[PDB]
Amino acid sequence: SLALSLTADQMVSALLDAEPPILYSEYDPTRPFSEASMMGLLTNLADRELVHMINWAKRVPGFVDLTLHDQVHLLECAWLEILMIGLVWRSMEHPGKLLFAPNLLLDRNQGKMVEIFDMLLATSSRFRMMNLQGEEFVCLKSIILLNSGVYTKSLEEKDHIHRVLDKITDTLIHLMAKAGLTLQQQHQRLAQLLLILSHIRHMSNKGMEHLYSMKCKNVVPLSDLLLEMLDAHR
Amino acid sequence: SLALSLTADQMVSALLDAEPPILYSEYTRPFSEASMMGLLTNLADRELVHMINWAKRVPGFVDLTLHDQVHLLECAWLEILMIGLVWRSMEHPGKLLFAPNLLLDRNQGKCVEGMVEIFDMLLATSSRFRMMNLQGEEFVCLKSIILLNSGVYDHIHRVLDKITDTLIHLMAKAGLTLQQQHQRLAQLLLILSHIRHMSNKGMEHLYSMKCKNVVPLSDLLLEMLDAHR
Amino acid sequence: KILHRLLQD
Amino acid sequence: HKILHRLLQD
Numbered sequence: 499s500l501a502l503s504l505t506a507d508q509m510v511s512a513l514l515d516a517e518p519p520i521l522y523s524e525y526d527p528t529r530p531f532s533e534a535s536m537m538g539l540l541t542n543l544a545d546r547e548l549v550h551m552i553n554w555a556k557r558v559p560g561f562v563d564l565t566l567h568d569q570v571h572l573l574e575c576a577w578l579e580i581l582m583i584g585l586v587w588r589s590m591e592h593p594g595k596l597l598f599a600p601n602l603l604l605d606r607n608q609g610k611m612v613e614i615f616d617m618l619l620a621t622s623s624r625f626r627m628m629n630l631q632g633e634e635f636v637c638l639k640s641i642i643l644l645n646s647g648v649y650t651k652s653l654e655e656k657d658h659i660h661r662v663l664d665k666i667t668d669t670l671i672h673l674m675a676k677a678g679l680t681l682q683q684q685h686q687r688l689a690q691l692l693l694i695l696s697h698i699r700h701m702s703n704k705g706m707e708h709l710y711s712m713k714c715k716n717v718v719p720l721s722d723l724l725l726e727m728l729d730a731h732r
Numbered sequence: 733s734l735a736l737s738l739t740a741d742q743m744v745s746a747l748l749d750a751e752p753p754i755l756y757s758e759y760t761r762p763f764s765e766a767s768m769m770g771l772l773t774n775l776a777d778r779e780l781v782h783m784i785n786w787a788k789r790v791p792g793f794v795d796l797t798l799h800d801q802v803h804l805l806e807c808a809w810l811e812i813l814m815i816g817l818v819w820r821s822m823e824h825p826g827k828l829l830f831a832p833n834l835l836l837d838r839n840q841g842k843c844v845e846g847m848v849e850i851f852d853m854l855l856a857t858s859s860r861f862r863m864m865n866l867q868g869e870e871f872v873c874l875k876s877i878i879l880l881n882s883g884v885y886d887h888i889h890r891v892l893d894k895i896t897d898t899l900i901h902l903m904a905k906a907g908l909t910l911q912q913q914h915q916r917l918a919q920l921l922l923i924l925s926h927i928r929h930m931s932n933k934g935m936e937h938l939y940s941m942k943c944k945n946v947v948p949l950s951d952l953l954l955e956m957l958d959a960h961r
Numbered sequence: 962k963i964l965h966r967l968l969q970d
Numbered sequence: 971h972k973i974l975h976r977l978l979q980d
């Protein structure tokens with residue numbers, strides 16, 4: 499009930515304050531590479547980001563109104579999408595490079611994966627040219643959490659998700675209206691943002707396939723939580 | 733280029749004019765995997781030929797280089813097949829109308845491993861379309877959007893914007909408020925994320941079907957499939 | 962279930 | 971070459 503009561507400015511305010519921190523990797527420039535080390539680094543990094551993501555989700559308006567079973571499902575579905583849009587957001591001001599961590603800044607010339615890399619690069623490039631705002635980003639990330647697993651007894655729950663989804667929509671429009679955008683510009687920008695979500699979904703799916711391949715090839719370890727998350731998709 | 737000079741009504745009528753026909757399947761209820769995948773593969777193969785000529789009639793598409801046209805079709809084909817499937821399945825809750833003579837429900841998708849999950853998602857999307865009371869004019873706008881957006885990573889952006897204008901135009905004509913307009917718009921576009929998901933999961937299923945070599949894939953399907961693998 | 966835990970706790 | 975190359979013509 500709390501989520502639907504909030505104003506658009508209160509919604510934004512709430513999402514901003516729920517923002518997880520930017521974590522560091524264990525990268526060391528004086529340390530050798532290979533595919534093992536890098537994927538190990540990113541796995542380690544992702545695993546710690548998950549713990550922050552889980553507590554971030556609980557602060558997303560309406561998320562705790564859901565059953566634990568539903569919360570689990572949404573996260574299992576969305577976790578990589580959410581990491582990736584995080585990755586893309588903080589990589590904006592670094593064209594042609596991905597900022598996995600403040601101390602882990604990678605180009606395409608250190609890969610192999612290279613296509614997932616390029617896709618993330620394109621998406622970042624898209625955010626940059628759109629001049630994506632922080633308030634827009636947090637709205638987008640929350641939408642991903644609620645939307646991505648909603649179309650997979652009672653629910654009820656499902657319709658409640660559509661209400662808060664609908665409330666994040668006027669919020670976005672509300673944001674674009676104060677920016678000085680005309681109605682036509684608002685609709686168009688809204689559409690541009692939401693179409694990006696299809697690409698983020700696509701990258702997530704291609705990513706899981708690479709991750710599942712990585713697990714079966716038992717090359718460098720996945721954490722217990724990351725394994726459980728990955729198994730949900732397989 | 734000519735696409736941008738078009739009005740909304742003109743955009744709508746061109747897209748409706750480009751619509752592929754609803755094809756039929758072969759004239760016994762499938763349950764095994766060989767029978768089901770056989771019928772679906774034959775159907776998709778024929779549908780693909782119509783999709784290609786449809787796509788050339790989507791305004792803006794022909795203005796692209798051949799290689800870009802190839803890329804976008806390779807990227808989007810299963811998405812476009814799937815939103816077509818989901819659309820014509822609207823008036824048949826709990827079932828998928830692959831063809832007017834091929835109505836499939838959950839129970840047959842129960843066999844062939846890894847199918848009933850993708851089946852359920854398609855059913856859920858169809859139902860979602862039905863509850864939103866999706867209109868045919870909106871549907872062809874969405875289909876066009878999938879074609880132009882799915883493999884897009886300036887011209888395409890402008891055309892994508894034009895289609896957004898068209899969607900809004902349709903909702904306004906339907907008597908919707910401004911708030912209802914951008915709310916409905918967001919709802920439609922969010923379903924596109926799910927259609928993408930179903931496509932990707934479908935794609936690995938088809939890959940699994942190929943390697944096991946139970947059903948003969950057409951050369952066209954094999955090429956469309958390997959563009960992802 | 963690890964994720965189930967962390968939501969709870 | 972690709973079959974799609976051919977079909978997108980005529």
Ligand SMILES: Oc1ccc(C(=C2CCc3ccccc3C2)c2ccc(O)cc2)cc1
Pocket residue numbers: 537540541542543544547581582584585598611612614615618705708709720724
């Ligand atoms: O903040 C982030 C941290 C890690 C990721 C991971 C992916 C995984 C796939 C991938 C491939 C190429 C380039 C980047 C990525 C990102 C990732 C996720 C899980 C894992 O076990 C390994 C890498 C994405 C965002």
Ligand SMILES: Oc1ccc(C(=C2CCc3ccccc3C2)c2ccc(O)cc2)cc1
Pocket residue numbers: 769772773774775776779813814816817830847848850851854934935937938953
């Ligand atoms: O109009 C359509 C015709 C065929 C399809 C096919 C898919 C492919 C995957 C899949 C899995 C479960 C349930 C449905 C589907 C649909 C499909 C595509 C190619 C193929 O060789 C076999 C099935 C989708 C829409």
